Design an enzyme around this catalytic site. Structure first.
Site, PDB file in Angstrom:
ATOM      1  N   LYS A  72      47.240  43.957  41.496  1.00  0.00           N
ATOM      2  CA  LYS A  72      46.121  44.047  40.364  1.00  0.00           C
ATOM      3  C   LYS A  72      46.552  44.609  39.000  1.00  0.00           C
ATOM      4  CE  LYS A  72      42.267  46.219  38.524  1.00  0.00           C
ATOM      5  NZ  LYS A  72      41.128  45.560  37.827  1.00  0.00           N
ATOM      6  N   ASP A 113      40.919  41.616  42.102  1.00  0.00           N
ATOM      7  CA  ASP A 113      40.440  42.643  43.383  1.00  0.00           C
ATOM      8  C   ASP A 113      39.144  42.185  43.176  1.00  0.00           C
ATOM      9  OD1 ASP A 113      39.033  43.256  40.746  1.00  0.00           O
ATOM     10  OD2 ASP A 113      39.935  45.206  40.415  1.00  0.00           O
TER      11      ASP A 113
HETATM   12  N1  LIG Z   1      31.439  44.517  37.148  1.00  0.00           N
HETATM   13  C1  LIG Z   1      32.832  44.562  36.542  1.00  0.00           C
HETATM   14  C2  LIG Z   1      33.501  43.573  36.155  1.00  0.00           C
HETATM   15  C3  LIG Z   1      34.862  43.626  35.836  1.00  0.00           C
HETATM   16  C4  LIG Z   1      35.388  44.818  35.658  1.00  0.00           C
HETATM   17  C5  LIG Z   1      34.657  45.930  35.796  1.00  0.00           C
HETATM   18  C6  LIG Z   1      33.566  45.780  36.328  1.00  0.00           C
HETATM   19  N2  LIG Z   1      32.736  47.021  36.342  1.00  0.00           N
HETATM   20  C7  LIG Z   1      33.841  48.130  35.980  1.00  0.00           C
HETATM   21  O1  LIG Z   1      33.779  49.255  36.113  1.00  0.00           O
HETATM   22  N3  LIG Z   1      35.027  47.443  35.609  1.00  0.00           N
HETATM   23  C8  LIG Z   1      36.229  48.236  35.121  1.00  0.00           C
HETATM   24  C9  LIG Z   1      37.054  47.907  36.593  1.00  0.00           C
HETATM   25  C10 LIG Z   1      38.559  47.949  36.352  1.00  0.00           C
HETATM   26  N4  LIG Z   1      38.964  47.523  35.127  1.00  0.00           N
HETATM   27  C11 LIG Z   1      39.410  46.252  34.739  1.00  0.00           C
HETATM   28  O2  LIG Z   1      39.680  45.519  36.049  1.00  0.00           O
HETATM   29  N5  LIG Z   1      39.667  45.782  33.527  1.00  0.00           N
HETATM   30  C12 LIG Z   1      40.113  44.443  33.405  1.00  0.00           C
HETATM   31  C13 LIG Z   1      40.960  43.620  34.244  1.00  0.00           C
HETATM   32  C14 LIG Z   1      41.199  42.530  33.958  1.00  0.00           C
HETATM   33  C15 LIG Z   1      40.731  41.849  32.721  1.00  0.00           C
HETATM   34  I1  LIG Z   1      41.075  39.925  32.379  1.00  0.00           I
HETATM   35  C16 LIG Z   1      39.925  42.334  31.911  1.00  0.00           C
HETATM   36  C17 LIG Z   1      39.540  44.037  32.400  1.00  0.00           C
HETATM   37  C18 LIG Z   1      38.365  48.484  33.963  1.00  0.00           C
HETATM   38  C19 LIG Z   1      36.950  47.922  33.922  1.00  0.00           C
END
Ligand SMILES: Nc1cccc2c1[nH]c(=O)n2C1CCN(C(=O)Nc2ccc(I)cc2)CC1
Ligand code: NI
Length: 316
Positions: free
Chosen positions: A240, A259
């Site tokens: 991830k 994830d």
């Molecule tokens: N409901 C929800 C839904 C997606 C992220 C979420 C949440 N809630 C939350 O706290 N986060 C964080 C989780 C960890 N993270 C993240 O994964 N960023 C990220 C990864 C890939 C891509 I394309 C774009 C953003 C930072 C943002």
């Protein structure tokens, strides 16, 4: 002493880029869990640090206004030509998001609905080092807590740039600063917990086992799967996090970070279940399949499509 600018306060010091609101919505991009270093310090005005400089950004329906603070005792001025290219490359404005939206929409009825309300959600092109350690801090965490850890980390280890109001701005630390023998104990004190160990360890590993920041630049030009495998050798970097880095700083638009968050979206909104794998829950094999599901569906910009859904899933 010095203060955060607005477009009303000090209109001389700003500069524009031709940028429609459909190609970019700052309020949907700068707080959607890609970068954790931007804050709406006054309404419609996002301030943050990029490459040892602070910026404030605001926008109209067809123009992106931006202004630079150099920090060291200099004569204040507008953004230069080269500094506008930095910002142009940061938002990846060469790529037409409107054409991408319609392309994903043509095979995805769900995306089509979400794309009505949530336009201008694009992928930032972040620095590899900043992105790596920010996403080591992301495990089992939320945007607020992640934003804190990264802010405190940069204050403790990174070079100071400037103060505006109460907010003191620091550049992201170099790898040597995070790899030292006290770094774990300091980072635990700053609230990172178990993540403190992986930050120090990965800093130390990139230096000694991979030869410093040049390695990350090699991964920019390496193919997606070579880069993903190389990053997965680092302490606290699994599939991830490796994918978050691939997508957001190694120019791999097909990388789909998998994830529990896309699991929920995939199942609830696409009716997806792991067919080829036996177990009904998440697993290494199943997570991989879900990434291939989205690449197969959306194409080689599948990661950017994911960001649109994520940006929509964060807003209620
Ligand atoms: N409901 C929800 C839904 C997606 C992220 C979420 C949440 N809630 C939350 O706290 N986060 C964080 C989780 C960890 N993270 C993240 O994964 N960023 C990220 C990864 C890939 C891509 I394309 C774009 C953003 C930072 C943002
Ligand atoms: Ni089901």
């Amino acid at each position: 002493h010095m203060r955060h600018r607005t477009l009303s306060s000090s209109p001389a010091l700003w500069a524009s880029i031709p940028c429609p609101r459909s190609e970019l919505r700052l309020d949907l991009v700068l707080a959607s869990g890609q970068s954790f270093r931007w804050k709406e310090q006054s309404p419609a005005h996002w301030s943050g640090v990029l490459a040892d400089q602070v910026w404030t950004l605001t926008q109209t329906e067809d123009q992106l206004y931006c202004t630079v603070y150099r920090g060291d005792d200099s004569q204040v001025s507008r953004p230069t030509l080269e500094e506008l290219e930095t910002l142009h490359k940061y938002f990846q404005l060469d790529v037409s998001l409107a054409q991408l939206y319609s392309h994903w929409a043509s095979v995805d009825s769900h995306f089509q609905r979400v794309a009505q309300k949530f336009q201008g959600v694009r992928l930032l092109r972040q620095d590899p080092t900043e992105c790596l350690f920010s996403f080591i801090c992301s495990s089992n965490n939320n945007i607020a807590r992640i934003t804190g850890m990264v802010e405190r980390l940069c204050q403790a280890f990174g070079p100071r740039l400037i103060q505006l109001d109460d907010v003191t701005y620091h550049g992201f630390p170099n790898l040597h600063a995070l790899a030292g023998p006290e770094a774990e104990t300091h980072l635990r004190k700053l609230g990172l917990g178990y993540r403190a160990r992986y930050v120090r360890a990965s800093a130390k590993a990139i230096l000694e086992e991979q030869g410093g920041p040049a390695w990350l630049q090699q991964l920019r030009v390496a193919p997606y799967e070579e880069a993903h495998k190389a990053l997965c050798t680092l302490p606290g970097v699994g599939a991830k996090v490796a994918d978050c880095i691939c997508l957001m700083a190694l120019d791999k638009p097909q990388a789909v970070p998998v994830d529990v968050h896309v699991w929920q979206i995939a199942h609830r909104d696409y009716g997806w279940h792991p067919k080829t794998s036996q177990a009904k829950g998440p697993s290494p094999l199943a997570n991989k399949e879900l990434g291939n599901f989205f690449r197969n569906l959306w194409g080689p910009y599948a990661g950017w499509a994911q960001a649109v859904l994520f940006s929509a899933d964060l807003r209620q």
